[PDB]
Amino acid sequence: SEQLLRIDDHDFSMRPGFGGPAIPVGVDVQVESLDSISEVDMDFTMTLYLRHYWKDERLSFPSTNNLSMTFDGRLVKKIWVPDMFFVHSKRSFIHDTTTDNVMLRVQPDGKVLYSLRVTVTAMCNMDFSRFPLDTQTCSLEIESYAYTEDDLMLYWKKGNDSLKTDERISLSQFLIQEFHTTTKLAFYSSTGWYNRLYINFTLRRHIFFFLLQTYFPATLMVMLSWVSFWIDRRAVPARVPLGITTVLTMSTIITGVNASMPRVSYIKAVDIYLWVSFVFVFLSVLEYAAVNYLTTVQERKEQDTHAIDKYSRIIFPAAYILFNLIYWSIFS
Amino acid sequence: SEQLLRIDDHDFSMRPGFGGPAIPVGVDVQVESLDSISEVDMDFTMTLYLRHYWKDERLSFPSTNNLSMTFDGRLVKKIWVPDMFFVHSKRSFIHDTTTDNVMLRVQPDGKVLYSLRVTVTAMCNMDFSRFPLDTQTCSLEIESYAYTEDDLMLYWKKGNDSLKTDERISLSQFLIQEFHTTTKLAFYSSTGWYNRLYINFTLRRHIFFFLLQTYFPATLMVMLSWVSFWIDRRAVPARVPLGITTVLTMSTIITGVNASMPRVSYIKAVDIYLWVSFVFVFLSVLEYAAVNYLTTVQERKEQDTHAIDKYSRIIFPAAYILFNLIYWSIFS
Amino acid sequence: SEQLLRIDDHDFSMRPGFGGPAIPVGVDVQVESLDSISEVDMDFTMTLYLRHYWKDERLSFPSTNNLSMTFDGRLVKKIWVPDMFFVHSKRSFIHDTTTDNVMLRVQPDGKVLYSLRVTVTAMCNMDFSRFPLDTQTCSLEIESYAYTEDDLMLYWKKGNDSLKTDERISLSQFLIQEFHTTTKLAFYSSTGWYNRLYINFTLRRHIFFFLLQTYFPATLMVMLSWVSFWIDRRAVPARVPLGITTVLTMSTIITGVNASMPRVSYIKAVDIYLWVSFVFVFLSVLEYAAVNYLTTVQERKEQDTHAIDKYSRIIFPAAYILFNLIYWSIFS
Amino acid sequence: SEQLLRIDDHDFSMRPGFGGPAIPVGVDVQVESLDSISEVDMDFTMTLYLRHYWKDERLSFPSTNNLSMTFDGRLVKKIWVPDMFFVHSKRSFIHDTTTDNVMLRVQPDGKVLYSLRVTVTAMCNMDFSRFPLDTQTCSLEIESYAYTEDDLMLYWKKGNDSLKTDERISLSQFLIQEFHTTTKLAFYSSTGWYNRLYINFTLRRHIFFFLLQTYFPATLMVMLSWVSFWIDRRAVPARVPLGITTVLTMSTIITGVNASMPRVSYIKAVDIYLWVSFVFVFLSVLEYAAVNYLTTVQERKEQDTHAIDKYSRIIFPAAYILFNLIYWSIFS
Amino acid sequence: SEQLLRIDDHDFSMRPGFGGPAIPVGVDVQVESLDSISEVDMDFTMTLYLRHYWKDERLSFPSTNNLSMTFDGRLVKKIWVPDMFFVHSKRSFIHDTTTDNVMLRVQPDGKVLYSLRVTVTAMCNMDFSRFPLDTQTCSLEIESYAYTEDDLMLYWKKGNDSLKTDERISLSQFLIQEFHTTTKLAFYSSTGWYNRLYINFTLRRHIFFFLLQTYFPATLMVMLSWVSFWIDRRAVPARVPLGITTVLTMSTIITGVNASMPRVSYIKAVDIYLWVSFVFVFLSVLEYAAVNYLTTVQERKEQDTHAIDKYSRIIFPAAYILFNLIYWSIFS
Ligand SMILES: C[C@]12CC[C@@H]3c4ccc(O)cc4CC[C@H]3[C@@H]1CC[C@@H]2O
Ligand SMILES: C[C@]12CC[C@@H]3c4ccc(O)cc4CC[C@H]3[C@@H]1CC[C@@H]2O
Ligand SMILES: C[C@]12CC[C@@H]3c4ccc(O)cc4CC[C@H]3[C@@H]1CC[C@@H]2O
Ligand SMILES: C[C@]12CC[C@@H]3c4ccc(O)cc4CC[C@H]3[C@@H]1CC[C@@H]2O
Ligand SMILES: C[C@]12CC[C@@H]3c4ccc(O)cc4CC[C@H]3[C@@H]1CC[C@@H]2O
Ligand SMILES: *[C@@H]1O[C@H](CO)[C@@H](O)[C@H](O)[C@H]1NC(C)=O
Ligand SMILES: *[C@@H]1O[C@H](CO)[C@@H](O)[C@H](O)[C@H]1NC(C)=O
Ligand SMILES: *[C@@H]1O[C@H](CO)[C@@H](O)[C@H](O)[C@H]1NC(C)=O
Ligand SMILES: *[C@@H]1O[C@H](CO)[C@@H](O)[C@H](O)[C@H]1NC(C)=O
Ligand SMILES: *[C@@H]1O[C@H](CO)[C@@H](O)[C@H](O)[C@H]1NC(C)=O
Ligand SMILES: CCCCCCCCCC
Ligand SMILES: CCCCCCCCCC
Ligand SMILES: CCCCCCCCCC
Ligand SMILES: CCCCCCCCCC
Ligand SMILES: CCCCCCCCCC
Ligand SMILES: CCCCCCCC
Ligand SMILES: CCCCCCCC
Ligand SMILES: CCCCCCCC
Ligand SMILES: CCCCCCCC
Ligand SMILES: CCCCCCCC
Ligand SMILES: CCCCCCCC
Ligand SMILES: CCCCCCCC
Ligand SMILES: CCCCCC
Ligand SMILES: CCCCCC
Ligand SMILES: CCCCCC
Ligand SMILES: CCCCCC
Ligand SMILES: CCCCCC
Ligand SMILES: CCCCCC
Ligand SMILES: [Cl-]
């Protein structure tokens, strides 16, 4: 086989067409899976197939018939091939069981297909200010390590038709949508200009799960604190334990939510809602302290419902409704 | 040894029978263990033996007697062998202590057995909507990396008798059952058609553990909230603390369950049961607020059991029974 | 050195005595440490020295005197050596700092000692039904990868004297005892019969730690629930808060134990004890609801201690004693 | 290509200019990302590009025109290159997908550019005494492993213009600022003097997040404990449960904060604030015990507000204000 | 360079002075960092420089002047070097970025310096019975893998001056002190006697952090339980809720401490203190049950402070003081 290719007779340390125009190299990608995601480290992991296409007259071979020849990674060391790398990647590797998952297919005309299977972890900067109502966009980037656009020209072989994605692709914690491709020119002052390829996608959460587990309990506890305004002010051993036990219950709820969340140490939209609800419950405990004190002062001086309860029955609900209208107009 | 095989005289970069019909290659598998499983990453890990069978006249050798010859991984580099890989795998490796766990056995006729020991991690997409009453099915897949069915024909050597599983195979968190084999043809537009082999199995949970730890406590707390309807309405400092302390107790139970569960952020069958029980307890606290208010209004106007308690003693249990009948007809 | 051994003149791809009887190979082991253990993955990790002994006339060398020659891993590649592997192992490796921890010692007669230092992780199936009163037994297994008993005969060189264990060997969470060796013949239908070597040991827990942290608190809370039967039935605002706060306290205890335990999702001996104690406390809350209701009915009809308290003072302790006697006769 | 360079004719085991003055080697760095940080292990991880510049007459080549030649890691093994390493690093690696991310560019004059992409984890000693108001400074260090300043002279090629940082660089838990470069001479008694290069940066936290989650709840609970001084001393079943339930609520808050914090086992500024607030709440429970006892003694002897309440209404708030003024003058 | 050394003319598979006396080899160590520590696995991780010194006449070279020659890891494969390994180590590796961090310096006389940078993880058996007042001692050990003292003699080159430690060495959770060196002879029955080198150090904790977080809260809760003896026995709805809420508060404290501690499943000094404090609080709840029962019996028979309170006011504090004196005389 390797005697028909004239491997011993050519310098394969240099590209096709050296000293002349650039070599055009086309690319396809097939995404096999999304493997995990980390919100505190801000990265994601992906497994894919990567395919390259070009022509080299040094590899043309005589044949009576149109049959191609096929080789593995042991030929790759002896000929020239393109030099792609993944930009902004944290780590990656090429699969090797039961042997190296790499292939070369060569036509009698000297056209080449070069194919490999690979796993990569890449960074994706995330903003959690609107959590849990946030939306994140991420991308994977491809570039030549050593050749500027004067020597190698890199492009998507079929436009957006160059990207395929597995029919069963999913994540346990997110909804994935809107896969599409783009390109852009980039500059490095030590070397010059390069073309870069992009794969783009969007992530979203299951909203009703978070509403049920977080917003609904806090709202129910605020409503229980209002029941106190309808209990007789003479029942001190009933009015006093109800308040402080409601404060304890709101406190344990907020502690459990904090223990369950990812460790992102800045203020988020759900934080604001919980601490405002805590303040409403605290203020209901100050209301009865005022009522009891003034009742006692009148009983002492002088020796039906009090006006403060009458007003609280109206004012506490109205204020909480106003808060909710503003909050949901901000976070939509 | 390696001079009887005519290694220096043949091109082992190409398959047996090249330019003619396909080479048939048979396969056996012996599963040694299931090593771990991840529900948030959606994958499982397995260790196994993989065995391959074929014939190659280039490896036939003269002998007076029927003795075979046996070799290790140092021959594999010099001859031709099949090119299997594990489809949809996240990572894998071949064992190498005290040396490479690889073997080749060759008959005087040129029949070959090729054997190796390997560990693989593979993806298995899971749905947790019915948790803890869910059932999961998983599979492992085997294919040639470079040869279509025009050049290599891949098959199970003995039918379903080709698969063996270790007598002590188990998992700490699941029951495993129904190991069996299948095959299917697959298509890639850049190359053509391939045959693929499958190993299939099913996973189930220990149901009574989850009933005892999750459903039983919530049911007991709902029943304690009903005790209030049988206590004298005049005892305000008894009726009021009982309710709010029952709400606190249900809240700490739900927080502990949430902290213990895998981090799958969508709504599950057990979530529904817990939040409905929370609402039943909240409504029992509103019932006495009504009774106490109306009692106070009559005492003020005018200066035995109340009808609301009489009805609640009947209506709250009946409604919870109706809920349970519907719920268990849905989740079965 | 390597010119006295006639390395260039012999085929070291095949065993001593090929075409004749089997080569006997003796083995010693010295355990250096037990490194970790996992209860949810069901495996353990160990570091050891492994030593092999045999004779090969191809390695005999002329000498005036009884001095042996000593070599490192660079000779191992050029001669024949045995092919041992660890059965049912998850992963393993051979140490290489400051160089490969491998040695060969050769006598003028052609006797060889082959020695290496290695770390291995191996599976050990565990049953936790009796936890914390469980006992586990584990073993490590050694075998030839390619040679049946017709070609290689594997044995412990000195009987049980072949195994040594480090004087400071320990685990943070277990007591280790009863190290001993065994052997057994095993069969594979594709190849034939093999002899296998075993190292065996036993694991146990610190019982009084678990009694103090788990059984003692639950027993104290059951006894506090009984104090209620000695408090005046007229004190409704005292009898009612005591019960529901005891239920809350038992609930937080059980939640903490569940959060601390390994994630084995089936029912264990300690689970049974905790949920029976929870039911005893719940039933003490139903007792006073009956007493208060019937007292109120008589006061209404008609307009000293009640018999139900008198009987409960005797019956609740007797029943709990009976439960404990049965339980400890079952789990011993 | 490699025949124009006279690789076979020169000893590339030794530096340019050996037996004469030192070889000057210039350096640039481009930071691609900060990848993670650990507060308990005291280290950080970074990915970067590293570039080296020097001249070697042995690599000058004849040409009619000013075109450079470009090579990969397969030339690096055959010529001389500098020997940089990262001082005080825990681990590091050079990227290799789809091939080694290493490049050599050579001019006809014999000037060389040597470039590679690398990930490193480095130690950064941290002090948490002022947490959460702490500020940390970290640095990365570069040096030659084998050559003193008598043989190799190492320097930043353009001053502070030699360092570039990615426009999207960020961390989930910190604010990063003030990237700048320095150099310093270092001494080893076994070999001599070396020049070392430094990259320096500063880290800070989001202060208002920690104020909201930690300081605000403790302050609200101290204020609720003061409400008791305004409730009638005759209401024993109201005054007594309020105190002990406030103590319980402060206790659960402190436990949640401790469970959420990194495991640094020495006293921190936020610890001091929480335990002082706990003591204020405890002392409010002792105040009413005194009032109730003395009231009972007078009622017994003899058979309006008490002076202790009157004074507590003034003294407890004044003392807590004084504490806050001192504390915030210390931690600023 | 490598032609002045007569590499092709000498057998570097054997030591200097073979068939004669032993080769003396001297050693220095420079500790760069302590990298982490694990209390449940019982090990620690360290990074260091290791340096070796010896003489070999086969490496003497002619020179007019006193200049040494310097080489990297590519010479190490061709000559003889010592064979050190780290005894009782779990894992280790040698650094390789931007190339292998290994160096050889050779004098014209044939004296050699051999130097490398390395990271190692080593076991250190720990006892936690006195926690948090425990003290731990650890050591790292160095030995030849293949040569007994008849062939190689290993020693510290300068006594205790052979060990240096970095001026900024620290751990987040411990105080480190008392670094010093020792040596000892060791015996293996299969080979003979070897000399071993030791590096020794000591670890201690920050005591006042643990006192503040663990012992102080439990002591305050015991003192609050005593307040009950000073409240009027007629106030049943005050005396009864105070006790059971104090029991709940002690229970949540102990649960939080247990959740925060390393998972060492045997009894520790701090365990004893917490469960004794729990028993004191339980006994204060039994005291009032007795007082209330006997008061009720006298009121029934017959139809000021009770003696049991009078005695409890003295006896409970005295007993707790006695316990503390004994406990701190035991744990010091
Ligand atoms: C602020 C809290 C303590 C400090 C915790 C912390 C501390 C350090 C850090 O880097 C992240 C976090 C995230 C969760 C934080 C906690 C959430 C609740 C708790 O009060
Ligand atoms: C919804 C909760 C907070 C957010 C938690 C979270 C947050 C992010 C995420 O990716 C997964 C989870 C799983 C558990 C969730 C928690 C369960 C209880 C808590 O209220
Ligand atoms: C059953 C609980 C929720 C589900 C938890 C779980 C869920 C899934 C799983 O694989 C293991 C475990 C172990 C601990 C379990 C918890 C123990 C307490 C809690 O109620
Ligand atoms: C001191 C606590 C128990 C011991 C815990 C521990 C124990 C050992 C250790 O190395 C670190 C820590 C950090 C958190 C500590 C806990 C914080 C709260 C708890 O009381
Ligand atoms: C004993 C507890 C349950 C069992 C827990 C366990 C269980 C198994 C194990 O190997 C270690 C530990 C450490 C912490 C233990 C817990 C401490 C508190 C809890 O009650
Ligand atoms: C196909 O191959 C035949 C030789 O068998 C050749 O004559 C013909 O030109 C080829 N056609 C193409 C399109 O390559
Ligand atoms: C077995 O080997 C003998 C030679 O010893 C040969 O004559 C015979 O044909 C062989 N039989 C088979 C079935 O291979
Ligand atoms: C020991 O070596 C001597 C040669 O020095 C030899 O004569 C003698 O037979 C040897 N003895 C044994 C037991 O090997
Ligand atoms: C550029 O190259 C030309 C040859 O094409 C040469 O004559 C000229 O001197 C070069 N100039 C520089 C600045 O190198
Ligand atoms: C130093 O080198 C000179 C040669 O330049 C030599 O004559 C002299 O003896 C050497 N001295 C020592 C102490 O090695
Ligand atoms: C299953 C969806 C439950 C949604 C509850 C939302 C509550 C929000 C209260 C403001
Ligand atoms: C040991 C099995 C316990 C099962 C309890 C199930 C309770 C379900 C209540 C609806
Ligand atoms: C230190 C040992 C403590 C043992 C307590 C066991 C309590 C069991 C109650 C049934
Ligand atoms: C969103 C910022 C909230 C800051 C609260 C600070 C409270 C401090 C009390 C002393
Ligand atoms: C900051 C140091 C605090 C020490 C408190 C110790 C309390 C011990 C009570 C027995
Ligand atoms: C917390 C609200 C207090 C309102 C007091 C009104 C006095 C007239
Ligand atoms: C909630 C505020 C009540 C204010 C009442 C004022 C009555 C004069
Ligand atoms: C639980 C609903 C009770 C409704 C009572 C209506 C009495 C007229
Ligand atoms: C605990 C059961 C008490 C039953 C009392 C029956 C009195 C007639
Ligand atoms: C906790 C404060 C007690 C003050 C007592 C004052 C007695 C005159
Ligand atoms: C909080 C201290 C109060 C002291 C009151 C003293 C009255 C004589
Ligand atoms: C705490 C023990 C009190 C014992 C009182 C005995 C009175 C006769
Ligand atoms: C607790 C504050 C009461 C104020 C009454 C006017
Ligand atoms: C708390 C609401 C009471 C309504 C009474 C009609
Ligand atoms: C899927 C929700 C079912 C609810 C049954 C009451
Ligand atoms: C709560 C049930 C009471 C039954 C009285 C007979
Ligand atoms: C609880 C102590 C009371 C002291 C009264 C003077
Ligand atoms: C709860 C036990 C009371 C005993 C009275 C003598
Ligand atoms: Cl009352």
Side-chain angles (χ1 to χ4, degrees), chain A residues 1-2 30 32-36 47 49 51 53 68 70-71 74 93 95-103 105 113 115-117 119 166 168-173 206 208-210 212-213 216-217 220-221 223-224 227 230-232 234-235 237-239 241-242 245-246 248-249 252-253 256-257 259-262 304-305 313, chain B residues 11-14 18-19 39-43 50 52 76-79 82-94 114 116 118 123 125 128 145-147 188 190-191 194 236-237 240-241 244-245 247-248 251-252 254-255 258-259 263-268 271-272 275 278-279 282 285-286 289 292-293 296 299-300:
Chain A
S1 55
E2 296 173 19
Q30 169 181 351
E32 191 175 61
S33 56
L34 271 164
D35 301 327
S36 53
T47 296
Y49 300 83
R51 300 176 175 112
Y53 310 79
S68 62
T70 294
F71 306 87
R74 289 171 289 178
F93 68 91
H95 297 274
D96 57 9
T97 293
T98 59
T99 191
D100 277 347
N101 292 335
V102 176
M103 189 239 296
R105 188 179 76 201
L113 164 62
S115 177
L116 52 99
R117 190 175 173 254
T119 298
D166 188 284
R168 302 181 64 197
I169 187 165
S170 68
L171 278 166
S172 185
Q173 294 167 339
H206 292 279
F208 292 110
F209 169 82
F210 292 97
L212 180 63
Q213 300 286 356
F216 176 69
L220 290 164
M221 287 324 295
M223 287 184 298
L224 285 181
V227 170
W230 304 86
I231 297 174
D232 178 2
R234 295 171 303 184
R239 292 274 297 241
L242 176 60
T245 311
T246 307
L248 181 57
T249 307
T252 56
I253 286 162
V257 170
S260 305
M261 268 186 76
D304 301 329
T305 308
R313 288 167 187 192
Chain B
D11 183 3
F12 285 109
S13 70
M14 55 161 57
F18 177 85
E39 288 174 290
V40 175
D41 307 304
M42 299 191 289
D43 50 49
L50 186 57
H52 318 76
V76 173
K77 311 306 174 179
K78 305 188 178 85
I79 59 166
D83 66 335
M84 304 300 116
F85 83 106
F86 294 104
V87 197
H88 287 111
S89 51
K90 291 194 180 181
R91 66 195 82 103
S92 56
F93 68 91
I94 284 165
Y114 174 42
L116 52 99
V118 60
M123 62 188 291
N125 272 14
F128 300 108
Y145 193 81
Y147 298 96
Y188 295 77
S190 47
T191 54
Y194 302 77
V236 196
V240 169
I244 188 76
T245 311
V247 167
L248 181 57
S251 186
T252 56
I254 290 174
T255 298
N258 283 348
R263 296 176 64 81
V264 178
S265 303
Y266 57 83
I267 288 168
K268 296 159 297 289
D271 296 342
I272 295 166
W275 288 111
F278 191 80
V279 170
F282 166 88
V285 179
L286 301 183
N292 191 42
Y293 175 73
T296 302
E299 285 179 344
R300 286 173 182 179

Side-chain angles (χ1 to χ4, degrees), chain B residues 15-25 147-154:
Chain B
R15 67 165 177 100
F18 177 85
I23 182 71
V25 177
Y147 298 96
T148 61
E149 68 164 340
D150 295 331
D151 277 303
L152 189 147
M153 203 286 292
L154 184 67

Side-chain angles (χ1 to χ4, degrees), chain D residues 286 289-291 293-294, chain E residues 226-227 230:
Chain D
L286 302 183
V291 165
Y293 175 73
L294 292 167
Chain E
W226 299 342
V227 170
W230 304 86

Side-chain angles (χ1 to χ4, degrees), chain D residues 79-304:
Chain D
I79 59 166
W80 185 92
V81 300
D83 66 335
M84 304 300 116
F85 83 106
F86 293 104
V87 197
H88 287 111
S89 51
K90 291 194 180 181
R91 66 195 81 103
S92 56
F93 68 91
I94 284 165
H95 297 274
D96 57 9
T97 293
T98 59
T99 191
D100 277 347
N101 292 335
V102 176
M103 189 239 296
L104 277 170
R105 188 179 76 201
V106 185
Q107 302 286 8
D109 299 341
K111 291 179 179 189
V112 174
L113 164 62
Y114 174 42
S115 177
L116 52 99
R117 190 175 174 254
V118 60
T119 298
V120 53
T121 298
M123 62 188 291
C124 176
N125 272 14
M126 300 161 193
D127 182 358
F128 300 108
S129 303
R130 290 175 49 88
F131 178 99
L133 300 102
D134 51 316
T135 292
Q136 313 294 341
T137 60
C138 297
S139 64
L140 185 63
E141 282 164 270
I142 289 165
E143 198 181 280
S144 167
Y145 193 81
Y147 298 97
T148 61
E149 68 164 340
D150 295 331
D151 277 303
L152 189 147
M153 203 286 292
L154 184 67
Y155 68 105
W156 288 115
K157 186 163 172 64
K158 304 187 288 288
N160 268 291
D161 286 351
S162 314
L163 174 63
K164 302 295 177 179
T165 57
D166 188 284
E167 293 81 7
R168 302 181 64 197
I169 187 165
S170 68
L171 278 166
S172 185
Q173 294 167 339
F174 289 100
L175 294 150
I176 314 153
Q177 53 265 291
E178 296 176 48
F179 275 100
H180 74 269
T181 65
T182 48
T183 69
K184 191 184 184 170
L185 283 173
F187 181 75
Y188 296 77
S189 56
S190 47
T191 54
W193 285 99
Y194 302 77
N195 195 37
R196 186 179 299 181
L197 312 176
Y198 296 74
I199 300 162
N200 305 283
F201 59 101
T202 297
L203 288 184
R204 302 184 204 268
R205 304 185 200 267
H206 292 279
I207 298 298
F208 292 110
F209 169 82
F210 292 97
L211 292 176
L212 180 63
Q213 300 286 356
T214 310
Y215 290 78
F216 176 69
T219 305
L220 290 164
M221 287 324 295
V222 170
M223 287 184 298
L224 285 181
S225 71
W226 299 342
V227 170
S228 61
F229 311 145
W230 304 86
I231 297 174
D232 178 2
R233 56 164 156 165
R234 295 171 303 184
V236 196
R239 292 274 297 241
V240 169
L242 176 60
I244 188 76
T245 311
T246 307
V247 167
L248 181 57
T249 307
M250 188 73 84
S251 186
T252 56
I253 286 162
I254 290 174
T255 298
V257 170
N258 283 348
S260 305
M261 268 186 76
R263 296 176 64 80
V264 178
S265 303
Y266 57 82
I267 288 168
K268 296 159 297 290
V270 61
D271 296 342
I272 295 166
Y273 198 93
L274 296 167
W275 288 111
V276 172
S277 307
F278 191 80
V279 170
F280 266 82
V281 175
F282 166 88
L283 289 172
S284 68
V285 179
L286 302 183
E287 188 260 1
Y288 181 62
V291 165
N292 191 42
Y293 175 73
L294 292 167
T295 298
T296 302
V297 167
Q298 281 300 134
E299 285 179 344
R300 286 173 182 179
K301 182 172 178 184
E302 292 167 31
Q303 178 74 359
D304 301 329

Side-chain angles (χ1 to χ4, degrees), chain D residues 11-14 18-19 39-43 50 52 76-79 82-94 114 116 118-119 123 125 128 137 139 141 143 145-147 188 190-191 194 236-237 240-241 244-245 247-248 251-252 254-255 258-259 263-268 271-272 275 278-279 282 285-286 289 292-293 296 299-300, chain E residues 1-2 30 32-36 39 47 49 51 53 67-71 74 93 95-103 105 113 115-117 119 166 168-173 206 208-210 212-214 216-217 220-221 223-224 227 230-235 237-239 241-242 245-246 248-249 252-253 256-257 259-262 304-305 313:
Chain D
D11 183 3
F12 285 108
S13 70
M14 55 161 57
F18 177 85
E39 289 174 290
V40 175
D41 307 304
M42 299 191 289
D43 50 49
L50 186 57
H52 318 76
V76 173
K77 311 306 174 179
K78 305 188 178 85
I79 59 166
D83 66 335
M84 304 300 116
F85 83 106
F86 293 104
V87 197
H88 287 111
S89 51
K90 291 194 180 181
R91 66 195 81 103
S92 56
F93 68 91
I94 284 165
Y114 174 42
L116 52 99
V118 60
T119 298
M123 62 188 291
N125 272 14
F128 300 108
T137 60
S139 64
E141 282 164 270
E143 198 181 280
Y145 193 81
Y147 298 97
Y188 296 77
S190 47
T191 54
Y194 302 77
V236 196
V240 169
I244 188 76
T245 311
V247 167
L248 181 57
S251 186
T252 56
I254 290 174
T255 298
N258 283 348
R263 296 176 64 80
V264 178
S265 303
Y266 57 82
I267 288 168
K268 296 159 297 290
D271 296 342
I272 295 166
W275 288 111
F278 191 80
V279 170
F282 166 88
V285 179
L286 302 183
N292 191 42
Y293 175 73
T296 302
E299 285 179 344
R300 286 173 182 179
Chain E
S1 55
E2 296 173 19
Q30 169 181 351
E32 191 175 61
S33 56
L34 271 165
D35 301 327
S36 53
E39 289 174 290
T47 296
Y49 300 83
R51 300 176 175 112
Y53 310 79
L67 280 179
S68 62
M69 294 205 278
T70 294
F71 306 87
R74 289 171 289 178
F93 68 91
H95 297 274
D96 57 9
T97 293
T98 59
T99 191
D100 277 347
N101 292 335
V102 176
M103 189 239 296
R105 188 180 76 201
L113 164 62
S115 177
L116 52 99
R117 190 175 173 254
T119 298
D166 188 284
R168 302 181 64 197
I169 187 165
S170 68
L171 278 166
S172 185
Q173 294 167 339
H206 292 279
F208 292 110
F209 169 82
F210 292 97
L212 180 63
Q213 300 286 356
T214 310
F216 176 69
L220 290 164
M221 287 324 295
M223 287 184 298
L224 285 181
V227 170
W230 304 86
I231 297 174
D232 178 2
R233 56 164 156 165
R234 295 171 303 184
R239 292 274 297 241
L242 176 60
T245 311
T246 307
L248 181 56
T249 307
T252 56
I253 286 162
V257 169
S260 304
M261 268 186 76
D304 302 329
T305 308
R313 288 167 187 192

Side-chain angles (χ1 to χ4, degrees), chain C residues 52-108:
Chain C
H52 318 76
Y53 310 79
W54 76 100
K55 186 178 172 175
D56 186 352
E57 300 98 309
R58 306 180 284 196
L59 300 175
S60 190
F61 63 87
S63 182
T64 58
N65 59 85
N66 299 311
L67 280 179
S68 62
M69 294 205 278
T70 294
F71 306 87
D72 63 48
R74 289 171 289 178
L75 187 57
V76 173
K77 311 306 174 179
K78 305 188 178 85
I79 59 166
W80 185 92
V81 300
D83 66 335
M84 304 300 116
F85 83 106
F86 293 104
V87 197
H88 287 111
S89 51
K90 291 194 180 181
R91 66 195 81 103
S92 56
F93 68 91
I94 284 165
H95 297 274
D96 57 9
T97 293
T98 59
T99 191
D100 277 347
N101 292 335
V102 176
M103 189 239 296
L104 277 170
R105 188 179 76 201
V106 185
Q107 302 286 7

Side-chain angles (χ1 to χ4, degrees), chain B residues 43-102:
Chain B
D43 50 49
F44 67 94
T45 306
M46 184 181 284
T47 296
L48 62 80
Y49 300 83
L50 186 57
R51 300 176 175 112
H52 318 76
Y53 310 79
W54 76 99
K55 186 178 172 175
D56 186 352
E57 300 98 309
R58 306 180 284 196
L59 300 174
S60 190
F61 63 87
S63 182
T64 58
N65 59 85
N66 299 311
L67 280 179
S68 62
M69 294 205 278
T70 294
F71 306 87
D72 63 48
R74 289 171 289 178
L75 187 57
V76 173
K77 311 306 174 179
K78 305 188 178 85
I79 59 166
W80 185 92
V81 300
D83 66 335
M84 304 300 116
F85 83 106
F86 294 104
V87 197
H88 287 111
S89 51
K90 291 194 180 181
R91 66 195 82 103
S92 56
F93 68 91
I94 284 165
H95 297 274
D96 57 9
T97 293
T98 59
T99 191
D100 277 347
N101 292 335
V102 176

